[PDB]
């Protein structure tokens, strides 16, 4: 399967890293960004969060050269000018953070067969969470979304609670790492005024559609969940704080056992269960979607609980992108 | 009213700052800590969070000199050796963080102080007050009192407004809390709190808090109805309460906003503030309110289930409440 | 004097703040940026570093309204379309960080402005001024001028005191500098500075600076005698100069302290400050001085070779100097 | 060789990590700190800076158990009560940061044969830097020092300059990561007032004896070097900025070639030479003492230069401790 990465940022670079880590048969034909391949190769090899990678990788003849892989570098900001027809592209990984279905469809017009958006999409874009609803993928879905990092953390936990106890209502907060949409010092973010305030000086409230998105991947939870975010001064790793009213009376220990059991069966490689005294840095490089923190959660009574689940919003999400690409390869 | 400050830390120093920032009968006659007065004077005058103060203040001859006002400096770790009888002390502000058991705190009375105000939740049933919530329940016979935690001072006023207007069925609270002096610059041991020893500015750190249960002490109707947890994050000051609450009556988010706005204008004047501004944590550095309701940040799931957001300067808001409680309790 | 602020960023907003703080008779007639006036008003009123300001300021009818000041908001990226003729502009404060070549900056004059003050070092034939060092060399014929960098404003006053008292043979400067808007929250591309894109709050980041060479422009006797470098570190504001200097005459560290203390009381009043306190960077947030000499931090190897330490609020110190230079130009044009 | 680690902090734990990483024949028989082995095991396994280690490690039977290694845990604050005679201790790694030769000699009185202090020492304590003067070690040296992280970075570079060009005079600044002697929020540090100011809110000047200490390992540089430090908000990795007047005329390129040559020959495994666009995070886990940054340095003229060298103050220094222990093992 021939892919290109459009936007070689945190997610674009770490998707390529996770492809190389599993020796994937996925063929990465090109990388597109706003700068030249020499700088993009440097950013791929040296990572402040995830450490150095691909020490033998070089920029040569306008390509990223790594073993038998030679990946063409492009620097074309306009999707209508991208040479996807000439490069016989099966899937565009759309990871610029700029691109509505109508904007993303320009990749198809430029000759790509499919687009995978590394973010929530607006319009008639099927949204998938590996281990929750990815088997709903149909080859007729030419533009798909892998949802947000937050939805990938919440949806597996919500599915376990739905299947074991039922959910009456849930309100979610994510305490989220700073990301590339934020600023080093106070500046303008036109769609999110708070989001422009200095990232490492502030706790910053933010909107998230993650809780509503769980209602699309698990229709039984439509209208039953909403939530919000706080952006805080860490460079990576985020946590979901789910306050949930269950349909059946249970114990905190029974919830722990249900999540532990799911991690060992239906949610293998998606959910992990820990009882260790973890902090955010313990999840840097963690490939799971959702790590249930058994010690951190609290119970008010037999139906009302606050549950805690960690996610590496960079590497966990990047690993899910590669999982979804490999699933689409096998089912298209 | 003659007071002494035992423990000249974040809270001890900012209590003195807030005394000097108002017209007050309070006479600060002595300060006790573990180091000499020259270093304590330096820390009072230069503050990384709250900026410089009292530029004309000097250390001379074992006293803090501010015009003709002279405060004795002591460096005596043992409460049984403190000269409270000789200094005719009306109230000890107990802000070391070491002495919260009645038996430990009573040693101040044995040493000659008439009353002790603990700047923290107490262990045992020490009368606990939140200004604007239950401070009028103070009795002159109460010789050892607590001003609760910063978090309880943020949550309790909001909980009182909800209780009085709508009723509360159940609530689960998270505080996203600034790093404090109990934390470590790099990973080290914290025997009662393993996570709390992990590098403070590298991590989101879960913590246990009794703040939601403590609301049950000031508002008996809410005993058994609230609990919660904390995440410590890399900001040096300002914290936020995220209250997920099931109310006893059907209402709207707008009705909650109106009730809080009304309370801030009347019964909670100078305790609660109501904002619709695009606020972030740094906007509350130096804020003297106990609880600042963030109208834009909150979400409603339905007519009974809400997630409400309230900010607090855990240093200056709390220090201001200590001075308010001193002025309320003491005879003049 | 009618001014406009082109680029309402850290420097643009704090220039307006410092104008209002001294109740300056300077008239700010317009602000240009890339975003709407309601968001720019919000950023002016709420500042993570310097606290809230102008609580009664409002966005109304495409203007910033503050008492009798009514400032037009523009959102025009192209200097050739800016209405400087219609607004009768005396000085453009050029604070976008995009326009530092004389040819780019001259488009402001073509659009009707009488003068441009670039809030950065300039390329080409642009007279560069440091208040208290060479600002009296300003000539009314200078239609495009530079206020140099924050770093040059910190180093040049100290270099002048050393030059005048002892002479300088050679010097090498490091600035340990706060993170700025050119940096990124997480690793990203900076095409002209690869290191400068690496996560700002995860890294000590080496950077190039022309500040030491620029001192040779304001003090020609020091041409070829200074160079230096920077490290960007995870603080949101306040920077420090570390000057390693070989002096022309033998002295003591205490004689250097006395010369700086004397200068701060006389020739460098309101430009240099002298401290012996145990200061740290946060102590200078909101400090309006160009250069604060840290007497306790410095070291002497011998009677000619010294390491001297001087602090600067790279935001507020520099913004205050912009207002001082505007007021000087007003009085001398 | 039977060793114990006294003070299981950043250096103590990472010394054990580096022993295990090279499968050293050094036998670690005991670890002493102020808290129990369950918490010390947790801190060994989970590291905010260097990531997780020894997943199979357990606290079991009062020991740290890792394969065939079983390390006894102690919690004795008083060196005079440590059971070094009973444990047949060949070398104490003294890494508490509390312990003059007379104070350190109490380890010998308690039954240890030798002490290696992980810091500069006062009194008649031979001080060694691997690759500079470690071959001056004599088995008769019962108390030895591995100097500071900063001295281990500067001394190898200074030796290359001395041998190739000669040094007239040098003034050094280290821009240094925050360390455990610092505070999360403003507090008192009696011998270092600035060092008590909030570590992640400030650039903090400090004194360092590192430049003078180079005069101990390279006597020809006595009286020719001094310097200072700035502590900054990073959790690890530091940089030396050496302003040096050389005894002979040269070029920046000739300095680069001399350091490159040394890194390939006499300074193999001690110095590294890079021309990459490096930043501090690129050296997290770097085992070199001194990494010369060719691109960062500047020349004023043919005798006056500013040279830049990086060091992982935790892992580089810890690796040198293990190198010095193995050198002592081979030469005693
Ligand atoms: N970072 C995370 O935690 C995270 C998690 C899940 C999903 N996502 C989503 O993934 C996307 C990328 O996020 P990111 O964090 O990698 O951002 P980023 O800013 O690191 O990466 C975006 C990249 O796209 C490039 N780019 C910008 N405009 C372009 C254009 N016209 N053509 C080509 N390249 C262009 C940028 O130069 C940059 O390298 C966003 O939609 C984001 O919401 C991010
Ligand atoms: N920081 C906040 O946000 C906050 C808010 C509300 C309540 N509190 C409570 O206030 C108390 C103080 O907290 P802080 O943040 O100011 O801590 P801190 O560590 O800044 O201050 C404690 C001070 O007490 C001194 N001290 C220690 N032992 C002493 C002794 N035996 N005798 C005299 N002085 C001694 C220390 O040297 C230090 O200066 C704690 O109980 C804390 O829970 C803190
Ligand atoms: N920040 C400091 O410490 C400091 C100190 C001295 C000098 N400077 C210099 O001042 C200048 C501004 O720096 P800053 O830190 O304020 O940066 P900034 O990024 O905070 O501000 C720049 C502003 O210009 C706006 N802008 C960008 N392109 C524009 C265009 N075409 N038209 C109009 N507005 C546009 C941006 O939206 C932003 O609001 C730079 O030249 C910088 O080197 C900065
Ligand atoms: N961190 C570095 O960058 C670095 C580099 C080189 C050398 N050093 C030196 O190494 C030493 C340790 O530094 P660190 O950074 O590991 O500090 P640290 O605070 O992380 O470690 C010290 C440890 O000693 C323990 N301890 C304290 N008093 C004790 C006692 N009486 N008995 C037993 N254990 C006790 C503490 O609980 C802690 O775990 C210091 O001398 C320091 O100067 C540190």
XYZ file of C-alpha atoms and ligand atoms in Angstrom, chain A residues 185-188, chain C residues 5-14 31-35 40 43 74-79 82 94-100 108 118-121 147-151 153 177-182 232 236-239 312-319 322, ligand 3:
110
model
C 4.282 33.657 24.724
C 0.808 35.313 24.608
C -0.380 35.576 20.983
C -3.504 35.301 18.821
C 1.823 50.162 15.813
C 2.443 47.667 12.963
C 2.445 44.213 14.661
C 0.521 44.181 17.974
C 2.637 41.419 19.586
C 4.672 41.294 22.811
C 6.577 44.499 21.875
C 3.657 46.249 20.061
C 1.208 45.749 22.973
C 3.754 46.642 25.702
C -2.889 49.292 15.342
C -2.338 46.769 12.507
C -2.101 42.971 12.952
C -3.369 39.767 11.224
C -6.419 39.172 13.538
C -6.201 42.165 20.034
C -4.482 40.319 24.515
C -6.472 47.329 10.828
C -5.778 43.743 9.641
C -3.704 44.308 6.452
C -0.601 42.057 5.975
C 0.608 44.195 2.962
C 2.439 47.457 3.969
C -1.770 50.640 4.880
C 7.458 48.448 13.019
C 7.084 45.492 15.453
C 5.912 42.590 13.159
C 9.425 41.003 13.156
C 8.993 40.515 9.323
C 10.337 43.884 7.981
C 13.980 44.727 8.959
C 5.677 52.485 5.121
C 12.050 49.332 13.628
C 11.816 47.494 17.014
C 14.788 45.265 16.023
C 18.258 45.395 14.452
C 16.197 50.817 18.497
C 18.570 47.753 18.190
C 17.775 44.528 20.146
C 16.896 44.037 23.848
C 20.406 42.466 24.232
C 20.223 47.826 24.972
C 17.663 34.735 27.030
C 13.951 34.141 27.726
C 11.954 32.182 25.112
C 10.266 34.439 22.498
C 7.531 34.236 19.843
C 10.049 32.949 17.173
C 17.397 30.427 24.803
C 8.703 33.373 29.470
C 10.497 36.738 30.086
C 13.715 38.361 31.444
C 17.216 37.744 30.088
C 17.089 43.031 31.351
C 13.336 42.627 30.978
C 13.544 41.922 27.217
C 9.817 42.871 26.901
C 9.153 45.858 29.263
C 12.713 47.331 29.349
C 12.831 47.392 25.527
C 9.209 48.670 25.177
C 10.875 52.545 22.370
N 10.166 39.826 22.498
C 11.295 40.404 22.824
O 11.937 40.112 23.804
C 11.829 41.454 21.884
C 12.657 42.436 22.377
C 13.172 43.374 21.543
C 12.845 43.326 20.213
N 12.038 42.391 19.716
C 11.682 42.453 18.258
O 10.395 43.002 18.113
C 9.695 42.433 16.994
C 8.393 41.840 17.479
O 8.693 40.800 18.396
P 7.598 40.222 19.395
O 8.327 39.389 20.376
O 6.655 41.294 19.754
O 6.892 39.206 18.380
P 5.362 38.737 18.323
O 5.334 37.537 17.488
O 4.828 38.636 19.687
O 4.615 39.962 17.603
C 4.536 40.100 16.215
C 3.118 40.496 15.868
O 3.064 40.869 14.470
C 1.930 40.308 13.881
N 2.170 40.218 12.448
C 2.863 39.262 11.763
N 2.911 39.488 10.477
C 2.238 40.679 10.308
C 1.970 41.473 9.183
N 2.359 41.167 7.954
N 1.287 42.613 9.376
C 0.918 42.945 10.612
N 1.085 42.260 11.728
C 1.779 41.142 11.519
C 1.713 38.990 14.608
O 0.381 38.584 14.460
C 2.075 39.377 16.047
O 0.959 39.828 16.796
C 10.681 41.433 16.377
O 11.414 42.164 15.401
C 11.569 41.099 17.582
O 12.864 40.666 17.230
C 11.526 41.442 20.541
